[PDB]
Enzyme design. Sequence first.
Site, PDB file in Angstrom:
ATOM      1  N   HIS A 131      -8.330  -5.435  -1.445  1.00 14.31           N
ATOM      2  CA  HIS A 131      -7.369  -4.706  -0.629  1.00 14.31           C
ATOM      3  C   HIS A 131      -6.374  -5.638   0.067  1.00 14.31           C
ATOM      4  O   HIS A 131      -5.619  -5.178   0.925  1.00 14.31           O
ATOM      5  CB  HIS A 131      -8.094  -3.831   0.402  1.00 14.31           C
TER       6      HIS A 131
ATOM      7  N   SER B  22       0.867  -1.201   0.000  1.00 14.22           N
ATOM      8  CA  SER B  22       0.000   0.000   0.000  1.00 14.22           C
ATOM      9  C   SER B  22       0.896   1.242   0.000  1.00 14.22           C
ATOM     10  O   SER B  22       1.760   1.365  -0.880  1.00 14.22           O
ATOM     11  CB  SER B  22      -1.017  -0.112   1.131  1.00 14.22           C
TER      12      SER B  22
ATOM     13  N   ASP C 132      -7.800  -2.315  -7.738  1.00 17.98           N
ATOM     14  CA  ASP C 132      -7.410  -2.132  -6.343  1.00 17.98           C
ATOM     15  C   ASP C 132      -8.439  -1.279  -5.596  1.00 17.98           C
ATOM     16  O   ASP C 132      -8.894  -0.244  -6.093  1.00 17.98           O
ATOM     17  CB  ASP C 132      -6.033  -1.468  -6.321  1.00 17.98           C
TER      18      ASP C 132
END
Length: 351
Positions: free
Chosen positions: A297, A146, A251
């Site tokens: 995620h 991330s 995403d």
Amino acid sequence: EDLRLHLLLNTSVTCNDGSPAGYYLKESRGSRRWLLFLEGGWYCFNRENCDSRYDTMRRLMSSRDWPRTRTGTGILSSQPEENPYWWNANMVFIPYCSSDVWSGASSKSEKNEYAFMGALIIQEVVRELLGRGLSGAKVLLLAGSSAGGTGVLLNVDRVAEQLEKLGYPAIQVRGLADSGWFLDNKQYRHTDCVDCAPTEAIRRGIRYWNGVVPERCRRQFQEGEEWNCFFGYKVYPTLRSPVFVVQWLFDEAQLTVDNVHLPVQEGLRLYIQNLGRELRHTLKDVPASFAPACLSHEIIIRSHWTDVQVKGTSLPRALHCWDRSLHPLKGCPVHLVDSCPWPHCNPSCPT
Ligand SMILES: *[C@@H]1O[C@H](CO)[C@@H](O)[C@H](O)[C@H]1NC(C)=O
Ligand SMILES: Cn1c(=O)c2[nH]cnc2n(C)c1=O
């Protein structure tokens, strides 16, 4: 198989609130491989939004409440059943406590309520590990998820330069960027945001953090335009170290900043299909990549990271093939990008 906390011996390298930064370590004395993993978790970019993050996300701004140990999971696991790739490596987890996408170089002062030291935290962790066995390494893999995956792209060449300048030219530095490859695309609905478009939030953040970007990318975009270097497809071609890119085609964080949530009509159908096509296009010339057609995620430190496959190859396998390629290979591919156009058209997507 736990990783043990070490707070930095140089206590001037700090988290947002001035407490010392640190790292969690599990050594493997028979191994010359080192995995340094950058945690993610968004960012903040002004006094008001950083104050709010301090009230309800304080572990991402302070070491005062960190636990003495953590369990390594996924690519950080020491069990071969959970981590077929690098189970015998020396493992390092670096907590994200600077709120600056790992880019900052600014201390707390009479003029600054918070310190933003992400780029210096990585530097200092590397320096202190050299005395704990890293001096003998053959490969240093800088990985992250991330905001930590974007941090890999911003910092991998600086780690390589640091080790060269310190006198360690035999350590091969490489990057693994997971879920940190974003597009500066048009939103599905606009003005929404929060606080705001990532491009504008990052432009403001760089000034608030004293943020730094890789030198070749900086020289291309020049003053005031350094925000461009936070976008994978723009910074990646400027990098010299080998970098493997892991990115879901759909995403969840990309969709959130695009103002997409969740009976899909034509306008949204076309928007989602175009996003996947654009992502695929940006990876066409990235030789080491893993990009499944999933809405997710989920990240590479999850325990079931081995389950997803592209064209019949898992991520641990692709990473092993990448290692072999850095010594194409028969039956050992490294470029794995789905071509189907809708989330979950790959049956192995996370449930
Ligand atoms: C601690 O780190 C800071 C920031 O990189 C550096 O300027 C300083 O020299 C370091 N202090 C020591 C004693 O190494
Ligand atoms: C959500 N998001 C983004 O949209 C983005 N764009 C560029 N860097 C980014 N980062 C670090 C991020 O976290």
